[PDB]
Amino acid sequence: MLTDPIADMLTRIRNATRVYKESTDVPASRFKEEILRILAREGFIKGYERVDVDGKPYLRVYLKYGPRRQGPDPRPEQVIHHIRRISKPGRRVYVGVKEIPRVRRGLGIAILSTSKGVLTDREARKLGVGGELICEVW
């Protein structure tokens, strides 16, 4: 069985990007879709769409990279240089509002899922709420 679906999304994404794919299908659910909405907004993915695969519905996460490069290793910089789960089943994590983390001195994020909905770090601070600390990305 699949086990932590959200990790499995972030992962599908991590692999996809390292082998430089244009896109990937993560099988779908509103929570993943929400995680993604925030990714797009924040500039990590290009966007994502809802597709069906042999009938069973997924999400194409279209991927962003850097421009091509100099010397040996033309492979472009990553846009998601870093993606990782934080709360997991089996260790859940929750930050208060005054614990919400500064990610890469601000140049990254943290998806918190709150009782106000799923938001970024700053988004929760300015919103003034705490939540389950989902992943950091940068």
Added chain:
Amino acid sequence: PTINQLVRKGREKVRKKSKVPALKGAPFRRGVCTVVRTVTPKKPNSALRKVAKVRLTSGYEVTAYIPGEGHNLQEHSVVLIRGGRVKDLWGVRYHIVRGVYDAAGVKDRKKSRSKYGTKKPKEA
């Protein structure tokens, strides 16, 4: 180990042994010599090292080194034991302290005299 495993079991805090039973934890103990003697060092060196077996006020009996050059000590001397080992000798875990009790200081010694328990030379 998983986390559920850390909850179940948890890390083991780590004990240690006291390289010194002067017992008592004390910084020094007083004791009475039995043997005053010499011994042959371990492999990498050669010499004659002066040392005393001692009965200690701790109900404890140990070979203890006699540092310095000139040493007076004999079989009934009562001495104060220090701690610290002589790396190339067998079973000597402590040092004697010069200047204290029966062990007198190193005479003629001008240089490191806190250690070696020797008073300061006069001058005119």
Added chain:
RNA sequence: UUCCCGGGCCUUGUACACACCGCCCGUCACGCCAUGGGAGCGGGCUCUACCCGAAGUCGCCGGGAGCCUACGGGCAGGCGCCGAGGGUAGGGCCCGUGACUGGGGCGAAGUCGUAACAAGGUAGCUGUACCGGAAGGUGCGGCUGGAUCCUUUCU
């Protein structure tokens, strides 16, 4: 060009690197620290069964068996339960001491072997099993963590 010696080149194994006149394993002997076992002894404690039980509270007696009385009762005294502790009979508990001994681990470095590392000269390791008090040999099975397609020790 097989062989003896000295050498060059590639390659392979290695625990050698003062480099095979290398390393190293064990035995017996001898010099050290420390352990177990250890009979009994010396003693501290706790458990259980029984037995004796100070104080004190409580309960009952409190009587032509004492003292007070307003006859309502009170005190003395007696008995009892409980009970600190003590003795008797066995289970552990810890400390001390110890005849007796088990190997141990280095350590002067002697002793005889050569087991392992090079296909260590019978490939090695291995669970076991019998043997040899020496490394150990051999049996069965397994491993590759094995080389390349008569014997003959040590430095």
Added chain:
RNA sequence: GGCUAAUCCCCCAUGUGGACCCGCCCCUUGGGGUGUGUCCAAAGGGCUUUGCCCGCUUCCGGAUGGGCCCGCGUCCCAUCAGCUAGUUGGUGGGGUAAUGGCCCACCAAGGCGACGACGGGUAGCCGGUCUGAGAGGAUGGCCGGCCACAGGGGCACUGAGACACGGGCCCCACUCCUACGGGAGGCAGCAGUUAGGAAUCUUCCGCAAUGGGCGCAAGCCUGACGGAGCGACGCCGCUUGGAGGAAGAAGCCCUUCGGGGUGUAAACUCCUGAACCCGGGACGAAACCCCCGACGAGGGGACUGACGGUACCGGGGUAAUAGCGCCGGCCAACUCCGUGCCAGCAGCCGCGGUAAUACGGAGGGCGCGAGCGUUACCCGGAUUCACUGGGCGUAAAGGGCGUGUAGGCGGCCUGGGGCGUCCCAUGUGAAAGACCACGGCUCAACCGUGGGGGAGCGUGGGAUACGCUCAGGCUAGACGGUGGGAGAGGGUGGUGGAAUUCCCGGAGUAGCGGUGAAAUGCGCAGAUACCGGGAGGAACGCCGAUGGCGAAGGCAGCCACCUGGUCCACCCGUGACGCUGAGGCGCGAAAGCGUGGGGAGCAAACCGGAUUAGAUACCCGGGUAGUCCACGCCCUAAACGAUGCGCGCUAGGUCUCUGGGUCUCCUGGGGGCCGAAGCUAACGCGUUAAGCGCGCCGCCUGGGGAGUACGGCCGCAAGGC
């Protein structure tokens, strides 16, 4: 035995009120009201005695102090796994201020435990402290809070309060008194003695302040306390002089004999003026009392120091203590002499066996400085127990395999709830410390004043993404249906041929066998070699693979039956039924054990023959257990992929086994080899991860001691865990 006073004790009375039984009402655990019945009070003293002060009684509330109870938190050992008789509940009762097996009788048979009961070990706990970048680790001295004990154990009395440190009874140990009858003690109160120890102060001053007891007060008491003394034990301030002064005295140091060093250091010049001498000299102290007013308020208003003639202000005034470690690297600081594996040094590496920057002095140098070094202990470093923050193919580390209990973990859609989670409000988070600001002692240390912070927990309100949960859907996971496949998967029976051994028979001589050579052994009782017949046991050539099957161990002739697992196709059924799995349970090579069979070949031990310096070994000849079977134990292993299971993701190429296809090929599922990305200490790994993730189990924490000891459990033992 006798006398006697009281705010000592008792009895009537009054009943504001209160206690108690039964009723009623309200409230809701024994809270409050009420009615009737019963029971319940008191003390007097002083004054200016006609009025007040000091007290006394019953009650109601307040305040402060406490009892008891509950959630939660609170060290090590599982080599402590079971513990439990008032023990667990109940009914009645005793007790108490009060709930309560707190106690007692009677009744039931419970209560606790791997979420660690019981046992053992250590230990006062906290505010805080030290350490740490933090998380964390360590600790709990002084000050504050709580507890507990007062020579050891038990016990009560008195009282508002105790089971009472300077109160009482008893037992025990000890010291002392003893007419041997018996008595007296209790510094863990301030000092002091004594022991023990590395070690820890004065038998000082004072009641002036502050606080406490009694008193109408005056006032007594107070080793609380405020001070002083001792000890660099710690912290903080301060002094050992300041300025000028040689291209640089002497001595001492090296020297390349030119010189370089000590060093502006000194001498000397000049100025300040620690100590000390002299005079003045505190705050801390205004109450209690005094008087006026009413013993109030208010108002004025006078007495009262231990520290101390100290702190301090003024005056005068002297150049006036330096030490300790270190100088091979870590690490800041180098040279000469001396010693020559000695003497010694030493935290680790490691110096010294004639040029030693490592030993010992000396010159010089560095670091600190009334200190400076040492030992001990704690944190740090140590991301070396890894929550932050580690690992397990070969480095220590995957459990031999599985089944599966507790437990942990859980796909997609919607709704209820709102337990986790989040937010706000408020209570709490004492003080001291810590942080900020200001201030007070000339500064600081030290102190005050104010501010701020703070995990946690109580209450109320709110949010609903995720996590729980309840209800309802779903089909992508899982299981099922049908049809088809491959296979040394297991169990049972059967049966085939080759070979060996043996026996019988025929034929046939003189050797055979074995080795590097040999010998032992066999052979005229005729062996070997050859032909035919029989018996018996064990194993299955070719096929055979670089193959297949199994969870693992492991599994090969052929046949039939019994039986497990597994793959594909179809997309049919259920509807998350899932994964993992400490404990348990079962399997588990070979060897080994028991009992009974069997016994051809082989073969531990053993017997021999060689070989060697010896041979106990390798080599040769014999041979027993055993190898085989049935049943029952043993439970190990290089039980190896030295690689736990599940799932998802991430180039390909090539070989293969086996299903399905529209069968240059594509598509499932195994087995290999190369190689993306990536990983890796490297070697290697690489859709059959050692990559990227998530879940759950196992395990590791330097080597030797040692898979030993001891304890336990298993075992017939061997021996295993």
